[model samples]
Target: MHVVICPWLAFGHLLPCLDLAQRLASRGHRVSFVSTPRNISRLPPVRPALAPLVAFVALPLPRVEGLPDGAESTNDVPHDRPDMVELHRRAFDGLAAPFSEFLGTACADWVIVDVFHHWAAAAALEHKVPCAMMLLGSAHMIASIADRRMSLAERFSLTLSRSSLVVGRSCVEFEPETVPLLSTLRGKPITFLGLMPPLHEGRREDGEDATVRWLDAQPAKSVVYVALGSEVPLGVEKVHELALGLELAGTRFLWALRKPTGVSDADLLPAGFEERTRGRGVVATRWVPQMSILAHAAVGAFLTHCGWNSTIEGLMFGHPLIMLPIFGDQGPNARLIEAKNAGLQVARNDGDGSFDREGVAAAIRAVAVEEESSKVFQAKAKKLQEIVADMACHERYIDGFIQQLRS
Candidate 1:
């Protein structure tokens, strides 16, 4: 089988699509992964063993002012809600011609695409090729967006037209609302690929050289892992507050602090904050091996931004979460995690309320040490992990989808 996979510019989107592509290649398919020249460098290094099975195609991204000079992904620039919607529409519009040309030349059996590249659907149809939309987030999120069921939307909202035929990534066990949207989409049967970890490996060796190493030095269930996803920026004030909270909790922790360019790591931390914590907390700037840290035996809880990927990874690793949803579907994802008893949300006085340092500290302590409550979450997380680990079911679904596409 031949498959062309087109992912959005975001690393989050690209990484998972690569995982799917690699899996397909492992199954003896010829796979071509497509993206902009700007994003190709960001892909995971291709293994030499799989070199012949997979290839990359880079298309030039159209230049638009206000977007960063080399910004291939949405994370590179701060997008206003309205602008982001328009940007996606324009991006897809620009991609239509070049993508159509590429499809004609490549002549793949199927095209797998990220949700952001909606143009792939029409382009695939034009080429008489089947296309499947891969949802990087949970199936529930896709359902909400496609079905237009969000609680509130302004007139200028970037809403999808009522299309009952939108195929999304989902399993039968997903929420009812999400299932309906999948039933509406066309082209091929939706396959739930299960949760994919970030393709990059965590730092190896000297677990003692880094925070994970320090945490390993501690007793079991003693360390908390604090990770706000790639999307959210951590301001200096909030960083300080988080430090204070960690100090108050008196727990060992590994914090992935996001330091925006031009901001020094010292600028984000309070004076004496690191000195105060000393041997207790390890703070990493920019990136860390989050999945590996979560899988660590010492990791007792997660302080998270509530992104779907993060949520699933935390649950899969049996780490109870302290949810601090920054924006978009994160709030709802947090709600679902909390509802499943695998996590708890930060206190919110209003619908759009944000959490403070005090709330962050409290939530962390509750998930880590609250005996009866924490155990319930731990049990629920373990059960969720078992459900997600059914590799045979996932493989069968993918095979069926591939067969349908070929037919």
Candidate 2:
């Protein structure tokens, strides 16, 4: 069967869909992956064995007012620009006609799509092709009744209800409770894929070698790996506080910090932060091999924004979390992980939902320090890792998903 996959234009969405594409292709199915040219180019190349079975369909992203020039994906648009989201949606919607033409001519058997792609669903329907809505975020977020009021959630509901079936980039073993709720709410058959831990074969980047070397220098399980993903742009004040928090934690740390928008890279941190934590901390603004870093023996815990991909990647290594979720599904993901007793969230103010250095420092120490509390966190994390890293278990889920598609 020939399958068409169009994911939301974000790395979080694109990466998982690509992983699924490879899995499907490996099983002797043709895959047409749709994305803008830049996004298609940015993805790691498909494995050679599967490359022959996969095709990249690069659709030019249509321009919209208020979006920066050549800004094709979410990461290109600065997080501070509140107006850019709607404009980006408008630009995304502009691909509908081109996509429809492609669907009409491609003779696709199935179309797999992100939650936001209502137009894609309609196009698939028009072509009389089965459309599977791929839910990539937390299932808990999907089951929340309060989300019915939001515009994006409204679109999410429409796309989900219209699809032929629902596919989740999730594991039933991990989210048993919410998975059934999602099926009950929509009255649609749902197949949740196992945790698709990306295959990071010997791919090394320019500066990543240095990062690995630095990790090698640290003692086993001594460093807290901090990365907040691309979308969460914490402001200067928050950055200062976070830096102070890491300093206060008095633990070894490696931060893959993205410079906050409107702030120069030179001034992203507090004055003399580099000097004060010279031997203890290293902040890299460039790309770091995240999976490689997580697999390293030196990383004790993850300080992250709790994006689903980041969350799964963290757990794949059996490391505890120091969660500080910013927006969207991250909060729900954090809550789910907390319920498993694998980590703690940075305490936030009830009044305004703000967190300080004290909260950040405390969460880090509780998860990373060599103490009773940290030991408990590590034990739970290791248990979850056993589930996440079980290739045979996840492979069965993928095979089951393929069987359904075949029928």
Candidate 3:
């Protein structure tokens, strides 16, 4: 079988597509993972074992004046520049022709596309290839799609009209009820393919992360893992509160911190923040192994932005969530996580994502420190750990879609 996996700018989307790509390739199918020239170019080297079956195809991204020169992924855009959203749209619109041409020549049987690029579906059809929307985020994320779009009607209509079917990065066990709502809302079939599992995670050429080594030194279930997803343009005030919150919680934590937009290389936290938390917390400013840290036995709970990818990663490792949702889809993502009894969400005042240190600290202690509350959350999350991202049990769901495309 020949398959082409096309994801939009974000590594969150691209990484999952690669997970699927590797899965398909492992089954002896030929897979072509496509993206913009610069974004795809920066991807880590593929595993040597599957190098022959899986390959990358970099298509030129049309230049947009406001967007950064080599910027293609969500992380490349500066925090305060909300204009990058539209920049991403225009840039992706440029991908249609190049993508279609690739499908035309590659002889692809299926073109699995990322969520926002409705153009790709039409391109696939123009090239006589069957295409399906790949919901790289949680299936519940689909529910949040039309929530913020002004062109709600057209966007939804165009999406379904182009590709009525979709492949979701989820499992029945993960969101049983919520995942089904996606199909009902769109009036299309949604296939619940498993998530990108920890087993498939890649490590740096140098080896285990210093954070992981630090985790190894801690007692089991004694530390908290903190990371806001790439999409969240964190603010200094926000980081200040989070630091105060973590300090208030008085638990060991590994914080994968990204600086706020329009900010300097200087620390964003209050004075003497790092000094006070030293020995108890490890704050990392650069890229670190989040999945590896979450999988560590010392990690009891996840302090997250409630992005679907981060939400599921926490659960996949049997760690309960301490959600501090911010932005589009994150609120709903947090709602769904809380609904499952697998986590607790910080109390926010409004849709604009306002929350206080008290709320953050309370939720953190409840999930990672307190005996009764933490146990309940841990029990729910642990139950899912066995099945949520268990590809061995759910790969057939994805493989079935592959067979459908071939037929």
Candidate with top lDDT is 2
Candidate 1: residue pairs that collide:
164-184, 165-184, 165-185, 166-185, 167-185, 207-213, 208-213
**What would the per-residue lDDT of candidate 2 be over residues 1-407, giving only the tens digit for each residue?**
89999999987888888888888988889999999998887887788878788899998988776787678877776677768877888889899999999999997989998988998999999999999988766667666532443388688888887797877667778788777656644776777777777767513343347888999999999999999886676888899889999999999999988776778867899898999998988999876888889989999999989998899899989999999999888888899999999989999999988999999999998898859999999999999999888878888989989888877
Which model, 2 or 3, shows the larger TM-score?
A: 2
Q: Rank order by TM-score, top first?
A: 2, 3, 1
Q: List per-prediction Cα lDDT, in the order shown.
A: 0.68, 0.85, 0.77
Worst 10 residues of 3 by lDDT: 198-207
Best by TM-score: 2
Supply candidate 1's per-residue lDDT for 371: 81
Better of 1 and 3 by lDDT: 3
Estimate, for each residue in 1-407, the C-alpha lDDT of model 3 and write its tens digit. Answer: 88888876787776667767877887889999888877776666677898988878888778888876787788787546767767866787888787777777898878887666677788887887777877656666766663444253564467566775677667666767766556543666776666656343443322367988898899999999999976678788878888899999899999998887766656688788899999899999887777678778898999998887787778878888999887766877888878888888888776665877888899898888888988899999888778775767667766776776665
Where in model 3 is the C-alpha error above 4 Å?
A: 143-157, 178-187, 196-198, 201-207, 350-352
Q: Tell me which of candidates 2 and 3 scores higher on lDDT.
A: 2
Off by over 4 Å in 2: 145-150, 180-182, 202-208
Residues 140-231 of candidate 1 have per-residue lDDT tens digits of 66556545541124211211121112334445654444554564333334445445443333113233446666766877778888888765
- List TM-scores for all candidates, in order: 0.83, 0.95, 0.91
Model 2 / residue 239 / CA error / Å:
1.4
Model 1, residue 400: what's the lDDT? 60
